[PDB]
Amino acid sequence: AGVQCTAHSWGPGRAVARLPRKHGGIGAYANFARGGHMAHPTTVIRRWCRKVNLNQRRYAVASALAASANAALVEARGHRIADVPSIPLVVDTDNVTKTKDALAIIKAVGVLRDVERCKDSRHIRAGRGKMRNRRYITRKGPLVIYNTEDVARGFRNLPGVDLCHVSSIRLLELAPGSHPGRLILWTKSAFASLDDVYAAKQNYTLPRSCI
Amino acid sequence: PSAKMRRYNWSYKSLRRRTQGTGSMSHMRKVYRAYNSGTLKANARKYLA
Amino acid sequence: MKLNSAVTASRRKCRKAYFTANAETRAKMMSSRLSKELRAEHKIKTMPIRRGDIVEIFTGGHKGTGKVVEVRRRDYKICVEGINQKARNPEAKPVPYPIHPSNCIIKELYMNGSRYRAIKRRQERNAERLARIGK
Amino acid sequence: RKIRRRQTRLQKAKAIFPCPLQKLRPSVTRCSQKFNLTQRIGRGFTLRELQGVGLSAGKARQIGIAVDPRRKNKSEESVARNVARLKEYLSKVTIFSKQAKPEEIQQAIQHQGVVMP
RNA sequence: CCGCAGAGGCCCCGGGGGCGAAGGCGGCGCGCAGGCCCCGCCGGACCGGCCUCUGGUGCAGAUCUCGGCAGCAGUAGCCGC
RNA sequence: CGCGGCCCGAGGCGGCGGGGGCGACGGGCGGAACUUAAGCAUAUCAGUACGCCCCGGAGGAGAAACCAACCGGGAUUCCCCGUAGCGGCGAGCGACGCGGGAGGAGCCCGCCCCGAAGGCGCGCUGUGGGGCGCACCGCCGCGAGGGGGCCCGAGGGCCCCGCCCGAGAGGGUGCAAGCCCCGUACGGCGGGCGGCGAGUAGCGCUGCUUGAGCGUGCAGCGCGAAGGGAGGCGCGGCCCUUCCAAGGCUAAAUACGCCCCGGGACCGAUAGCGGACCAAGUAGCGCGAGCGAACGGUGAAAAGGACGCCCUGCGGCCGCUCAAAAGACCUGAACCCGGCCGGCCGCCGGCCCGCCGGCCCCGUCUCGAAACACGGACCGAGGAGCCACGCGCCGCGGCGAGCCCGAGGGAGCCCCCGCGGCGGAGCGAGCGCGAGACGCCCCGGGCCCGCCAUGCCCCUGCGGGCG
Ligand SMILES: [K+]
Ligand SMILES: [K+]
Ligand SMILES: [K+]
Ligand SMILES: [K+]
Ligand SMILES: [Mg+2]
Ligand SMILES: [Mg+2]
Ligand SMILES: [Mg+2]
Ligand SMILES: [Mg+2]
Ligand SMILES: [Mg+2]
Ligand SMILES: [Mg+2]
Ligand SMILES: [Mg+2]
Ligand SMILES: [Mg+2]
Ligand SMILES: [Mg+2]
Ligand SMILES: [Mg+2]
Ligand SMILES: [Mg+2]
Ligand SMILES: [Mg+2]
Ligand SMILES: [Mg+2]
Ligand SMILES: [Mg+2]
Ligand SMILES: [Mg+2]
Ligand SMILES: [Mg+2]
Ligand SMILES: [Mg+2]
Ligand SMILES: [Mg+2]
Ligand SMILES: [Mg+2]
Ligand SMILES: [Mg+2]
Ligand SMILES: [Mg+2]
Ligand SMILES: [Mg+2]
Ligand SMILES: [Mg+2]
Ligand SMILES: [Mg+2]
Ligand SMILES: [Mg+2]
Ligand SMILES: [Mg+2]
Ligand SMILES: [Mg+2]
Ligand code: NA
Ligand code: NA
Ligand code: NA
Ligand code: NA
Ligand code: NA
Ligand code: NA
Ligand code: NA
Ligand code: NA
Ligand code: NA
Ligand code: NA
């Protein structure tokens, strides 16, 4: 880009600036000329990824999990949990394949206001980006963590809800926007298994508690 | 009247100006179509077998 | 949420497909809902719009009822008799106001042998669908 | 590339069921003085080891054993180790005839990875 | 620390919008300042306060580049055949 | 002087092949200079640009005349990992083995035996057959669920109350739509003996090339063989360890443009490809090789402008369509300008507002600029320390005598497993030898290890111990 033409500088002595010119006299090549190249064009050899030690990734996920059970942090983050019985919230749901039954459970455990918070917040984003396949924006709802149960089909279509298997929890879902306290709904099996999913991390010790 | 065509790498603009794809490309289009979605491969398999 | 990775969700590609569809795709994209009485008679919800049937306009500034007299397939618009732009003189041939098919309801369909066969083909295919779910 | 390599592996395993993807290969010592006391996987069994188990190169290649006639043993400890390896493998291997019904072939399990690490 | 473009979140019944968004013109107020806010007219469909993230991120000059355009000026000029 | 066979040649006929094209990837040849060395000639750039020739869906390479020195490995290719050396010993340049992975596959001909058993118009100037004795893509389809009121040119808007969900990805529709339309989620069908390659290997002289250093690989000329080759310093001698050149074939793991499909913290009309515009490598320019632009946007709907009145015609007024002229068109800034209406010279300060007081033209090189030092008529938009790798030091996080998302493998962008390496002991050209004695911290002394030199003692002795 910017270097496909033939352009050479005229010298001094013709009453014009010394940049390269095309045959008719049009300026070319320079970054301050119309049609020229970038001063320092962007390249793909830029380093796009970053390295994180395994121990610190594990520390971060554990700390976010511990924040998710604090109630005060869950309220400080955006979540409507006035009607929630307890934190952590554990529910024995068996298998759910109809969205109607999932909604029934959601209303039963007193978490419906957070789903309606997201269902009513869909809108069109400002600026560019709406023409880059990012047209719509919604708020974040509760997160469902399961294990040896079929709840995905029931819960998939509720706006704001996200699903996770208990053996591979994602940090970007525990702390959306880098804010840690997110409301989580646990199935019974997921809680019981989490009891020892950390015992399968070989030669790993949980960091010590402090004041 | 040289048998080969005059082509030089020190000018990719002239190569760009006259080359394959700057015309109709009738026969090549037909053969490519008959191959990607057609019976050219079946015919070849029958002829070879 | 879409799971078929072969289907594009790109806005640019979707709009390009909309603006450069061929004839049959354009015809299919110009469908209207059937009335409740017609829904009961044939177990289908929508029908491609065709010249010669009767529609009722249920939204806009040109609400009314009339017969379809022309289909403009490269605009996605139809002309129905009696829905015109207001004339400058009483003696001039009326100018129809084009209407999108998605804001009218089919009251009565112009019937053909081919239309009968197409409808029958439709019904026998969602019969399998209904037999494959529920009940 | 990861996904593609896995797909190729799966297809090939499907095409030869229930034979394992890998062959049985010998146990050899790592070369220099720095790795003198440990073992790794080698290329193929020598003819002396096969004679120790009374097998031919054709039969060995038939039942999924790698054979390397270029290699020569340098001590009897290697010969003993690899003869024992061959005996174990032969004890654990099962052959299906062309007269076996299709069902019992379906019951077979296809081995994964290295045959005996 | 002020400002620009974009990404991830919040904005107590789910942020502001044809009862009028961005932008333009004129006028108050606030801030040492960079700047911000409100009001009136024009306009006709989008916009962003706070937290974290990212960068092709701020012009008076380079005999700078491209486009538009002034004085000179109703001036010089419209002398071969 | 004639005619039959073999041999070596000539003309014609039949049937089959070849030639040219392809801005990438691949193979083979020919082959620069700018540049760096703060000059420059060896060196570097670079075994690159460029020129010529030749295939394919890949190509090339490939089953040891190999590494190594071990309680050894074992055809080729590709990934991870890291210093011997070369060098106006300057600037610079630079491999391989061991180790961990992906992938994995082996073979033939000649020579020797038989001799037409053969592919039979050929071929004994050798066809044909054999070792001899012991032992995943495409095609086809169906596809749910909303009303009432207010107000707008039209609602997808506002208020109230509902329904669908394996479908709340998106696109269209007169204004923000799961339920107005198309789609989206959920299907089906097809696919012991004999025998191992000669103008060769090697050597001398010369040229190119390599990290290869009294030679890494190749080549010309001269000489030219029988058991031979190699073991990173030459020559001669004796051993050990390993292999068998001068003939040939071979899948996989790997690379990559045009063209087709998908995605994006990318650009948004002076940007992004030169090229968003029914006509771009176009119009246009050059004898020619070549060079090469500018130009996006009415409105929901063309509904694209009724009638009437003036006018010698050109045109004008009044009004019409529309929510609006938005009238060849979105919005419509600055510079510059015309009319009407108010004033009289720039900036700062005081004031009842034209009086008083103060004020050289900025940016730049420079001891020194208002300078008769340079640049600058005016306005808009664009316009210049970013990125990769290496080295030093500082701050922060995790773990800690240890530490570590290597490549890769498990069908989980974020989960699980996963070697080197670096650190842990130094010094010495090297054969090699090898640290405890004190201390909140810091500085300094004192001792100990290695290198160099010495005295005494003694075993296994140019070896050990003590100083
Ligand atoms: K251009
Ligand atoms: K070179
Ligand atoms: K000067
Ligand atoms: K001068
Ligand atoms: Mg450009
Ligand atoms: Mg904006
Ligand atoms: Mg509008
Ligand atoms: Mg940018
Ligand atoms: Mg400027
Ligand atoms: Mg005059
Ligand atoms: Mg011929
Ligand atoms: Mg250069
Ligand atoms: Mg120089
Ligand atoms: Mg210089
Ligand atoms: Mg010079
Ligand atoms: Mg070099
Ligand atoms: Mg090949
Ligand atoms: Mg439908
Ligand atoms: Mg929509
Ligand atoms: Mg040989
Ligand atoms: Mg060289
Ligand atoms: Mg040696
Ligand atoms: Mg290959
Ligand atoms: Mg352009
Ligand atoms: Mg004043
Ligand atoms: Mg004064
Ligand atoms: Mg200067
Ligand atoms: Mg100077
Ligand atoms: Mg001077
Ligand atoms: Mg000055
Ligand atoms: Mg600018
Ligand atoms: Na404004
Ligand atoms: Na810039
Ligand atoms: Na050729
Ligand atoms: Na080809
Ligand atoms: Na514009
Ligand atoms: Na518009
Ligand atoms: Na002065
Ligand atoms: Na000067
Ligand atoms: Na000047
Ligand atoms: Na000390």
Side-chain angles (χ1 to χ4, degrees), chain A residues 154-161 163-185:
Chain A
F155 284 98
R156 272 202 314 228
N157 218 43
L158 293 174
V161 171
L163 293 115
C164 236
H165 198 261
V166 73
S167 61
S168 57
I169 305 190
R170 269 129 39 217
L171 170 84
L172 299 196
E173 304 251 81
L174 291 183
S178 140
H179 301 128
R182 172 151 198 195
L183 164 70
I184 300 179
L185 189 151

Side-chain angles (χ1 to χ4, degrees), chain A residues 4 32 34 50 55-56 58 132-134 157 167:
Chain A
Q4 278 177 117
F32 56 85
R34 173 191 188 268
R50 250 77 202 163
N55 213 62
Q56 320 198 233
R58 282 160 171 184
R132 305 244 177 113
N133 311 327
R134 303 185 287 271
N157 218 43
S167 61

Side-chain angles (χ1 to χ4, degrees), chain A residues 10-93 95-161 163-198:
Chain A
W10 304 1
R14 302 163 90 154
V16 291
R18 291 184 309 199
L19 86 157
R21 282 171 199 287
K22 276 187 266 209
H23 180 85
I26 317 286
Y29 261 72
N31 53 288
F32 56 85
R34 173 191 188 268
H37 59 64
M38 270 176 86
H40 330 102
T42 53
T43 304
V44 294
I45 69 161
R46 177 212 306 263
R47 201 161 71 109
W48 304 93
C49 295
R50 250 77 202 163
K51 299 174 278 189
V52 189
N53 291 347
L54 184 65
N55 213 62
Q56 320 198 233
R57 314 211 284 277
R58 282 160 171 184
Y59 201 142
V61 156
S63 208
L65 270 183
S68 97
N70 187 266
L73 261 42
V74 173
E75 253 281 276
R77 220 227 72 91
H79 284 316
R80 303 285 188 269
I81 58 59
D83 282 320
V84 178
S86 53
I87 303 301
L89 183 76
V90 191
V91 189
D92 220 13
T93 66
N95 283 359
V96 176
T97 49
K98 298 284 294 181
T99 310
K100 234 168 148 201
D101 311 346
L103 255 196
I105 296 178
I106 299 263
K107 198 148 99 41
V109 287
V111 84
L112 175 124
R113 277 198 59 203
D114 213 41
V115 168
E116 307 203 281
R117 182 190 137 245
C118 310
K119 155 83 164 276
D120 287 6
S121 74
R122 178 171 162 107
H123 66 269
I124 301 205
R125 155 204 313 264
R128 196 145 321 257
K130 87 164 79 67
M131 68 178 331
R132 305 244 177 113
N133 311 327
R134 303 185 287 271
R135 204 168 182 83
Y136 284 97
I137 302 201
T138 316
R139 285 162 197 217
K140 275 320 196 83
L143 170 71
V144 180
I145 307 199
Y146 58 93
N147 162 224
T148 88
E149 296 200 11
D150 262 12
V151 290
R153 268 160 57 190
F155 284 98
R156 272 202 314 228
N157 218 43
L158 293 174
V161 171
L163 293 115
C164 236
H165 198 261
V166 73
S167 61
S168 57
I169 305 190
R170 269 129 39 217
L171 170 84
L172 299 196
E173 304 251 81
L174 291 183
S178 140
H179 301 128
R182 172 151 198 195
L183 164 70
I184 300 179
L185 189 151
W186 299 87
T187 76
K188 216 175 100 97
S189 58
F191 217 56
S193 317
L194 171 80
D195 283 289
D196 68 70
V197 142
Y198 273 83

Side-chain angles (χ1 to χ4, degrees), chain D residues 12-117:
Chain D
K12 179 170 176 135
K14 194 126 42 70
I16 68 174
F17 183 90
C19 308
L21 271 187
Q22 320 262 38
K23 313 184 143 25
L24 179 83
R25 304 188 107 103
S27 174
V28 301
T29 310
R30 304 176 179 174
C31 303
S32 72
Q33 177 78 59
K34 170 182 189 166
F35 313 93
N36 229 352
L37 300 167
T38 36
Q39 314 281 311
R40 58 175 234 260
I41 280 287
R43 193 198 161 82
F45 293 87
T46 72
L47 298 175
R48 273 205 44 171
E49 282 135 29
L50 300 187
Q51 277 302 73
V53 278
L55 231 54
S56 80
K59 294 266 319 187
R61 299 220 178 93
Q62 218 176 359
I63 67 173
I65 293 167
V67 183
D68 186 23
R70 190 184 295 117
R71 179 167 71 97
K72 302 280 168 319
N73 287 104
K74 284 133 179 94
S75 74
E76 291 85 352
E77 309 55 25
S78 35
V79 175
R81 178 177 59 244
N82 285 320
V83 162
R85 205 167 154 78
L86 284 159
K87 302 246 195 51
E88 244 302 296
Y89 175 81
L90 286 155
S91 70
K92 287 199 325 194
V93 67
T94 278
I95 308 190
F96 301 108
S97 38
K98 300 75 185 62
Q99 293 68 21
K101 290 296 302 177
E103 46 290 35
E104 70 74 59
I105 282 270
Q106 318 321 63
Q107 308 323 110
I109 303 124
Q110 198 174 39
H111 176 83
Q112 307 298 333
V114 188
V115 169
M116 302 159 19

Side-chain angles (χ1 to χ4, degrees), chain C residues 88-103:
Chain C
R88 297 179 168 270
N89 314 122
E91 59 214 19
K93 156 166 35 62
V95 192
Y97 179 80
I99 280 152
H100 199 270
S102 73
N103 34 43

